[PDB]
Design an enzyme around this catalytic site. Structure first.
Site, PDB file in Angstrom:
ATOM      1  N   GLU D 229      -1.467   0.188  -7.615  1.00 41.27           N
ATOM      2  CA  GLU D 229      -1.579   1.245  -6.612  1.00 41.27           C
ATOM      3  C   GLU D 229      -0.852   0.683  -5.406  1.00 41.27           C
ATOM      4  O   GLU D 229      -1.408  -0.138  -4.686  1.00 41.27           O
ATOM      5  CB  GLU D 229      -3.069   1.497  -6.286  1.00 41.27           C
ATOM      6  N   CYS D 263      -1.683   3.857   2.615  1.00 45.19           N
ATOM      7  CA  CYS D 263      -0.677   3.991   1.566  1.00 45.19           C
ATOM      8  C   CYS D 263      -0.245   5.442   1.409  1.00 45.19           C
ATOM      9  O   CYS D 263       0.949   5.745   1.283  1.00 45.19           O
ATOM     10  CB  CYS D 263      -1.286   3.556   0.248  1.00 45.19           C
TER      11      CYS D 263
END
Ligand SMILES: NC(=O)c1ccc[n+]([C@@H]2O[C@H](COP(=O)([O-])OP(=O)(O)OC[C@H]3O[C@@H](n4cnc5c(N)ncnc54)[C@H](O)[C@@H]3O)[C@@H](O)[C@H]2O)c1
Ligand SMILES: NC(=O)c1ccc[n+]([C@@H]2O[C@H](COP(=O)([O-])OP(=O)(O)OC[C@H]3O[C@@H](n4cnc5c(N)ncnc54)[C@H](O)[C@@H]3O)[C@@H](O)[C@H]2O)c1
Ligand SMILES: NC(=O)c1ccc[n+]([C@@H]2O[C@H](COP(=O)([O-])OP(=O)(O)OC[C@H]3O[C@@H](n4cnc5c(N)ncnc54)[C@H](O)[C@@H]3O)[C@@H](O)[C@H]2O)c1
Ligand SMILES: NC(=O)c1ccc[n+]([C@@H]2O[C@H](COP(=O)([O-])OP(=O)(O)OC[C@H]3O[C@@H](n4cnc5c(N)ncnc54)[C@H](O)[C@@H]3O)[C@@H](O)[C@H]2O)c1
Lengths: 458, 459, 457, 457
Positions: D229, D263
């Protein structure tokens, strides 16, 4: 592949021995002993180390026939050639004992009033990864100068010659080589990685295939450790119209067929000028057809079985591909029926630069012959290779030979003679043949800490 | 990459100077093709013709000396007097190799009888060079000069904060008449470097930089079967024993640590001082470090400029913070200077023990570490207790002891009662994580030769 | 070589040679795959399902030609090559029928139907495939990959490039759009080049542990997902209360299918002390009765091995095991002749330290190990670096279920014959790799699982 | 660094230093995780779900201390740190309730209930985590990983070891068995050592592209599965017919949450020509109104950035973008002082060749690009090496859905605020990594999917 290093006699197909891979405790002990050995050995005088080299030469000669028999038994080399390998290896011990010490003298420099010198210091433990084709010579080629320089040497030998490895260790121990100064370990690939990454290994030396060199060189670089990589070759052997044809043919046959073709620096690509091409080919084929192949315990046989069954399979596929590509099979090109690992002495002609026989290393008794239009074409063909180990040129034109040598992309050029390694000269190549040099002063200094010592720089 | 551009920022002012896009596929191919075609011609030149090109390069550098020094200072912050000295040293290098280099390429006789075998030093091909910002001119020429004399081409990938210097060097070498492709440079990103290492036109690689760069590039070179020289970081020990010429020792120590605002591979970084003289040394060293002048590097009187890179000042400060947290005694500095520029105070850490960050890491800035040794044996053990091994200094009036300790020091250069430096006349390079291979003298010339045996009539 | 080489393992004779793809050819393969994907991703799932039926139809129209190619290049008995074609065509139809529903959006627990999960196509999938089922291995992955809306770009094993060309012709005849399915004869450098190319979204590998590690490392470095379906050394446990004859029949079929050359073959027979001798006697008798020879003869059970070097490696594994103390009950020899035949082989008294227990024996060599009891059998089964599938034979249903739960592998067959099947997951743990093929698993492995959420305020 | 160093980014002052784990400590962490797993895999799902409830209770009991620690070590406004704790505690309860059913065996299409799919525990999962949500990133994966019957072994970012210590204390108080949850202050060599140890079954990484690549390569080489991720550069598309007030609100919250250090932040604003100027004016005004300072002062919307070197890097990305031609509308400067503050920043006239378009800007810097039409907007959104999440604002429901189907990312938010949520999948494509977290995805990623088939004859 297996849980063991396996020895099988390639002449008979029968199992000789199996040895388990080194476990964690055994790898640790090999490294710990090498390091403590080095700590003492680096403090010895060069004179003491040179005497140890003489002692090793003596112990090897005392066990010479047992050693040669071990070499033949495990990898199939004709016994005459295994004995020659022992002779050459022992002579190397004495040569370095004689000529090596002076190579470790400090160098003066141009710094005024003798205030700076260059010293050649021991580096540490050198990990050596070695192949089966010269199970003794390949080891000593590096170990002798590495030891003289004050380093320890830790061998991982090819898994099909662990009997030879055990014997070498016994002989070096009999000679009084201190514990850890020379040692070996039957490590698997993971064990080798472990050692390369251990701070007790200072540097690495590899003799082997291109794939092995790349896999090991990558790990050494990642660990900030220097390598010498002595890898495969596809040496060109150029014959021009004005050559001594019969001498060229004799050198060609010897260069290709030594050790059943199983030599890094074998003559592998015969590049022959158009005018002499047919005569060369006819004579080469005749001489190759007359070579005797069979039981390598028989002193008079010229060719043994190949060392590894899988490598005979691979070589046959290289010949099959070449013929499919248009090469002309003039001799051999078949596996011999029976339980041993024999492959017929083979000659391929009409080989062009796109073909397998021209572009890959043929590590067995298979000659490739290519016709060159003239000397310029011969040079271009010679250099059209990913390999660059050694080369041969036969021609009466001495000036041309010297010019061609300067333009050949390889580490050794033999003019009107037989290529060989020799303690007195550099050995090693360029391109995918690797880098670094062995023998003479090169092999001694590759594993030194070259250290400037400069007093009163003010 | 951090950006799509190689970015130049003046570290004294914090202001952008220039931005240059990474080389695209066409430009990388062009650099490689031109290097290869250049090499094909250059390998066929005489050593006399190459030696003259070296003189011409020294001449062209000298003609552009102030402009070159100003570019160095502007892009990476080096005091201007030191930038001028870097130019002077580099031009002198060109002349030294032009004079002394050709003989190094003579064929070697061998012990094979009757002159039947010689060793020749042949050109290898195009050498890819990966270089750092700390000596943007000197580090390039240190390798390029002998590489070129050997008959190779040199293809530079310079540090992305000194592309102005790189462009200028290329200008100067073109002015000198260096053939196209024989010297060249390309603004490749990391992927571009990988592509070049893996291209058959690159024969070998030379790297000067951090341990991390050396590992990343060395791994790739090994995988491609290409030889390297790795000239990486240092944490050089500087040993002062009770019987030292203390005045000279302190002067050498200060120069050793604080040259180029601390930013030198072979800087004296770990001072290891015998208990009997420790206090005396420490007092003199701290006072001398406190007297150094820091500021605008265009001002000649300043001894210390800003550090070259903002992120690296930050890293250094963390190394100082960690060391203090571990128990080091801050005797001087240990703070970033407020302002737009990238200044860090001249710093001295004492009571430094081997477990500490200041002892174990390369402190690449103006931060001295001082460790006390019980005796000469303890000093030697402390010196060798490092993953680095570039160079070392020993100060002692005991000539014999100095020689014995030099033999036992795990590094590639030892300076006894003097100032460590690189010099064309001697080998440079280290062991352990400092890398491998050697530059300068005949070492730097032969590292990138194909050593070729030529043997006639072997029968 | 400079060529991918096809050699008939029954005769030793060269069939064909194909040069490795050059730079232009690699670029062409990638460019076509990407443009193929750009259109294919926009089709209805039902159109892609119909394309699957059309592929099944074209494969059945060329079924005997395909089977003959498989046998000719890699030595599989022709009866089994025909069964491989039948299974491969049936897979096309099965996914055409059941696959589309698996790509329906999922509802979520977000209030008022504001969020769904969509299964989007990912891109071009690079597939690196082995020679042992030259057709089935390709379709096992390609069929669901295609149905999910991806392109499939195959690099096949260099000894089966004839099969690879024929598969391409058949899929093209079916109307599969250009680039949606394609293949390229890349060497190892060409593979690396493609993995590092942005047009490749993800990678699937079926092959040896060594291949999986080499490719998986490169995929990981490129931030690209893998499925790695690697070797196995499947345990086959027989307890005292088994139907012994059925256990023996399943054991023989499990080990000797495709001349032993099966990732999920039964390779380590682990037999409880009470029934061990009876199992061994019957297993050896059935193995000895298997017919080996020309694989064009429909009644031969065993062909030559596919690769000469691999027969050589297997013989060394047998040699090492005997040297370590295994008892050779049957075979253990290369057959004299120009073909690549190895005798059906049985090793007994195999203990956990031995080569025959620790390495994958990828040929017709059974290893038999005696277990003290069911607990020992379980521990022996799990004492492996592999973990693909397993078999247990026992009348005790509760015990079998408990053992299955504790077996470190991706498939457990109780009192039956292990196999891959479209309806269930296939794939393993440990050095057998990771990721799953078949059922909805193989379909979703190469989807972009995408949350679509409206009015999150 | 010889230590993991904590420094308060609001003050510049050292908080703590922790030595890297030595060989004994790495061995102990691995040994404890393996023994913990051996027992935990045998527990009932009901017991594991109760442990999750107990963890949620223990976080809530220590909620303020946890929040304060997060703010102290990495600079997050205290209100956001409290929200992080609240969300993490709710995740524990969500999986306690909804998770167990996800582990139910699946029936198959094999007739007569002869074959089932089971979700078995895999082993110890090594987790490598970042500093931006020191609690939530850990639990986002640890919660489902634990429920599936795995152990979780954490390597946390070296600037948040205080948080890591505190998490361990809380989970230990909750009765989480030894080795079931654990952590180790490993350096990069220690991580390599664990990845290569057989006691690590698989790896999960949340971090930068560079980290994912370095770790993914190692896991692939070890034949171990990953979830990666990684970074994002999420496009936020605003078409002419958008609800402009809501779009601006979502845009500001999207970019500036956690001082931009997210993110899935909205990083690239892609605005249709007709609305571009109005959007830009309002966005700039809103950004200028945000309060920045001491993160313990609740008025402050923005804190300092977490790491001094990363502020340096962000500033260089801003400097490069201006040099390339971006227009600086707000901020673009380090704030003078000993803390690590960077001004709320807006760059406009950003074109796809520029740094601000092509790199992840992990701090308070918005990039605004003008699109000529909807097709251009889509093309700009997809012109990225990242593909984590995306937002689209348009009044047209049909157009939104059509564009969502073509957006190359793992999440699409239509007329709302993007976020992670236990109820939906999270993760991306391209260099944003692969694999999915949350919902049933994060639970099944680290299962051994095992077919169990009886009587297959
Ligand atoms: N001096 C030279 O230039 C020279 C001399 C002799 C032989 N050779 C070359 O040797 C080759 C044939 O010998 P070989 O078959 O033994 O070569 P090989 O490369 O397969 O093996 C050489 C050694 O490397 C080890 N090795 C290989 N891969 C490894 C890995 N990944 N990790 C750790 N160890 C590894 C092997 O076990 C063996 O000890 C030929 O190509 C030949 O030209 C070169
Ligand atoms: N002769 C020597 O031993 C010597 C001399 C001077 C400086 N140094 C060392 O240089 C370091 C400081 O310089 P720096 O900050 O420029 O070092 P650096 O390692 O960060 O960069 C050096 C060069 O390597 C390149 N590089 C780094 N990683 C790369 C990658 N993965 N792929 C391709 N290229 C890559 C950089 O772009 C730069 O051009 C110090 O450690 C110093 O000691 C060594
Ligand atoms: N589903 C499964 O788990 C499954 C199914 C069938 C076969 N297998 C396995 O296949 C193996 C035997 O087949 P094989 O000999 O073809 O396997 P192999 O690993 O040697 O080759 C498989 C494929 O990988 C390629 N390859 C290998 N190394 C490569 C590299 N470094 N770079 C690029 N490509 C590379 C080969 O060319 C071939 O296409 C056995 O271990 C068997 O168990 C696994
Ligand atoms: N769910 C997601 O997709 C997600 C969520 C939050 C943050 N992120 C990403 O995190 C990044 C910022 O966080 P960061 O600065 O901590 O990232 P980072 O990659 O530098 O560090 C993350 C973790 O990886 C470790 N690490 C890095 N390199 C390593 C190596 N080679 N070996 C072993 N460990 C290594 C670090 O110590 C840390 O524990 C951003 O790019 C952001 O987008 C992603």
């Amino acid at each position: 592949t297996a849980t063991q290093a396996l020895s099988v006699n390639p002449a008979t197909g029968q199992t000789l021995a199996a040895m388990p891979w080194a476990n964690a405790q055994e790898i640790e002990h090999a490294l710990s002993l090498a390091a403590s050995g080095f700590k003492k050995w680096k403090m010895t005088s060069v004179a003491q180390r040179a005497q140890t080299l003489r002692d090793i030469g003596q112990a090897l000669r005392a066990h010479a026939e047992e050693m040669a028999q071990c070499i033949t038994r495990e990898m199939g080399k004709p016994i005459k050639q295994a004995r020659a390998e022992v002779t050459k290896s022992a002579a190397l011990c004495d040569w370095y004992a004689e000529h090596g010490p002076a190579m470790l003298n400090p160098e003066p420099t141009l710094v005024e009033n003798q205030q700076a010198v260059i010293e050649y210091r021991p580096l540490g433990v050198i990990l050596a990864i070695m192949p089966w084709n010269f199970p003794l010579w390949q080891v000593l080629r590096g170990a002798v100068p590495i030891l003289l320089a004050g380093n320890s040497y830790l061998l991982k030998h090819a898994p099909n010659v662990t009997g030879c490895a055990q014997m070498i260790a016994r002989i070096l121990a009999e000679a009084g080589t201190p514990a850890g100064v020379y040692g070996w370990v039957n490590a698997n690939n993971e064990g080798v990685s472990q050692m390369i990454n251990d701070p007790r290994i200072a540097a690495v030396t590899v003799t082997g295939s291109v794939r092995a060199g790349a896999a090991i060189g990558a790990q050494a670089g990642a660990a900030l450790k220097k390598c010498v990589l002595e890898l495969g070759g596809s040496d060109p052997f150029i014959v021009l119209n004005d050559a001594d044809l019969e001498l060229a043919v004799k050198a060609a046959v010897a260069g290709r067929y030594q050790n059943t073709g199983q030599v890094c620096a074998a003559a592998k690509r015969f590049i022959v000028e158009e005018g002499i091409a047919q005569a060369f080919t006819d004579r080469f084929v005749a001489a190759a057809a007359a070579l005797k192949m069979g039981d390598p315990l028989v002193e008079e046989n010229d060719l043994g079985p190949m060392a590894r069954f899988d490598l005979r399979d691979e070589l046959h596929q290289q010949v099959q591909a070449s013929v499919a590509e248009g090469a002309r099979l003039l001799l051999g090109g078949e596996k011999i029926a029976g339980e041993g690992n024999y492959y017929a002495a083979t000659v391929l002609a009409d080989v062009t630069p796109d073909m397998t026989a021209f572009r890959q290393e043929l590590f067995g008794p298979v000659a490739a012959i290519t016709v060159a239009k003239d000397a310029a074409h011969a040079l271009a063909l010679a250099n059209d290779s990913e390999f660059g180990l050694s080369a041969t040129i036969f021609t009466a034109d001495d000036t041309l030979a010297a010019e061609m040598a300067a333009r050949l992309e390889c580490g050794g050029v033999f003019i009107n003679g037989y290529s060989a390694s020799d303690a007195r000269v550099a050995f090693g190549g360029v391109k995918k043949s690797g880098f670094g040099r062995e023998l003479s002063h090169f092999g001694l200094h590759e594993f030194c800490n070259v250290q400037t010592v400069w007093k009163n720089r003010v």
